[PDB]
C-alpha cells in the first residue's frame, strides 16, 4: 500500500487547502495513502526540516515546492539519493533531481498579468509589486515575467516592491506603506493568491477605488468578491485542485515503472470580472 506525503508552502493556507482537495481525491482514486503535512507559518528551515523527516520515515514519494535553488536543490537530491522519488508542484527545481514537475509555468503567468496590466491601463500606469518573497523561486518568476511584458511599455513604470509573506494582514501592511510613499502609484500587481485581497482592503478603506487597477494572483472567494464588485480588475487563474490530483497521478505513474513527462504545465490565463462566473 503505496504511502506519498505532500508538503505545502503554509499548511492552512486556502490555496493549499484546494491542492490538498485534489491530492486526496486521486489518492482515494488508487488506494494511496496521502500525507499532508506543512509548517503552521511559511518558514524555509522548519519547511527543510519536514522534508527531511519525512524521508527517514520509509515513504514511497515526495511532493513538494521547490522553493529556493540554494536549499532545496540538495535537499531534493538529498531524498533521491535515499532511492525516495520526488515530484516538484507550483514551484519547480528545474536543476535538480526531481523526476517531473506538475504546476504553473511560473513565468509565463506573470508575463500573462504583465500583458493584461498594460492592455486594461491602455499603457499608462505607475505600479507597486506586492509578492509572496524575494527568495521564493515561483515569486521571482512572477515578478520577472510582468516586467518582460512591460518593458516597452514607456508609460509603465516599477515604484515599489515589497513583501508579504503570503498573509492578507502583511499584504494590507505593505499597501498602506506604498501609498503614503507613493501617492501617484494607480496600479497594484500581486503575485500569490492573497496580496490583491490586502490591496483591496487598504484601497477601499481610502475610497482611492477609481484611481487604483488591481490584478493579482488566483481565485479565492474573496477575490470573486472584490473582482465582481469592481475594486480587482483582473487576477491570473491558477488551478490547484488539478495540480494536486496530477501530482499524485503522477507519483503512482513513476513508482509504477511507466515514463512521465518531465514538466505538466497546468493551465493559466487572466480573467476579467466578464469572464464570471466560471
Ligand atoms: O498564498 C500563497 C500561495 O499563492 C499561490 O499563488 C502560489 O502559487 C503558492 O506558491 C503560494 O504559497
Redesign the pocket.
Known amino acids: 500500500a503505496y504511502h506519498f506525503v505532500l508538503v505545502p508552502?503554509?499548511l492552512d493556507?486556502d490555496?493549499?487547502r484546494l491542492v490538498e482537495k485534489g491530492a486526496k481525491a486521486a489518492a482515494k482514486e488508487l488506494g494511496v495513502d496521502l500525507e499532508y503535512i506543512g509548517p503552521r507559518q511559511a518558514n524555509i528551515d522548519e519547511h527543510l526540516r519536514i522534508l527531511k523527516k519525512a524521508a527517514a520515515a520509509k515513504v514511497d514519494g515526495i511532493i513538494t515546492?521547490g522553493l529556493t535553488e540554494a536549499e532545496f536543490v540538495p535537499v531534493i537530491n538529498e531524498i533521491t539519493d535515499k532511492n525516495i522519488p520526488v515530484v516538484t508542484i507550483?514551484?519547480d527545481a528545474p536543476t535538480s533531481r526531481r523526476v517531473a514537475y506538475v504546476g504553473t509555468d511560473n513565468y509565463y503567468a506573470g508575463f500573462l498579468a504583465g500583458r493584461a496590466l498594460a492592455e486594461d491601463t491602455k499603457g499608462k500606469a505607475t505600479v507597486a509589486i506586492i509578492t509572496?518573497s524575494l527568495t521564493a523561486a515561483?515569486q521571482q518568476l512572477r515578478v520577472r515575467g510582468f516586467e518582460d511584458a512591460v518593458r516597452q511599455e514607456k508609460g509603465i513604470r516599477i515604484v515599489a516592491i515589497e513583501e508579504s509573506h503570503?498573509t492578507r494582514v502583511q499584504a494590507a501592511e505593505k499597501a498602506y506603506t506604498i501609498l503614503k510613499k507613493h501617492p501617484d502609484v494607480n496600479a497594484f500587481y500581486g503575485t500569490?493568491?492573497?496580496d490583491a485581497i490586502g490591496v483591496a482592503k487598504v484601497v477601499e478603506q481610502f475610497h482611492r477605488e477609481q484611481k487604483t487597477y488591481i490584478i493579482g494572483?488566483?481565485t479565492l472567494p474573496e477575490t470573486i468578491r472584490y473582482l465582481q464588485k469592481g475594486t480587482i480588475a483582473a487576477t491570473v487563474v491558477?488551478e490547484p485542485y488539478e495540480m494536486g490530483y496530477k501530482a499524485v497521478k503522477m507519483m503512482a505513474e513513476i513508482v509504477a515503472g511507466k515514463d512521465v513527462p518531465v514538466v505538466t504545465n497546468t493551465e493559466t490565463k487572466v480573467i476579467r470580472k466578464k469572464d464570471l462566473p466560471l
Do not use: K
Open positions: 508552502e503554509e493556507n490555496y493549499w515546492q507550483d514551484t509572496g515561483h503570503i500569490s493568491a492573497l494572483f488566483d491558477q
